[PDB]
Amino acid sequence: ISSQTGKVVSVSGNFSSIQWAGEIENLGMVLLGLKEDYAIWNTKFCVYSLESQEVLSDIYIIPPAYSSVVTYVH
């Protein structure tokens, strides 16, 4: 729920964890996380442009190897 909206929006994408979130240049508002082997470009970790918009990147986030162990992102 935003100020500027005043309404309870649901996140369209179906995620497990939101290890990081926040505003980036050109996108406005963003969430890291996942949905549900050692290639850098596989990543298993969807960015999400907030307000139920496009995944926006699935290309150069952290490897799926590390996807099991990581608890926090900065």
Partner: peptide
């Protein structure tokens, strides 16, 4: 005694602000 004082804080993107574009001018 405090050689610095913070009198505001502003919305910044990640890292921080892109150089050259921001401006500051003191009148009196």
């Amino acid at each position: 005694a405090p050689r610095v004082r913070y009198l505001a804080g502003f919305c910044c993107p990640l890292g921080g602000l892109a150089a050259g574009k921001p401006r500051v001018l003191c009148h009196e």
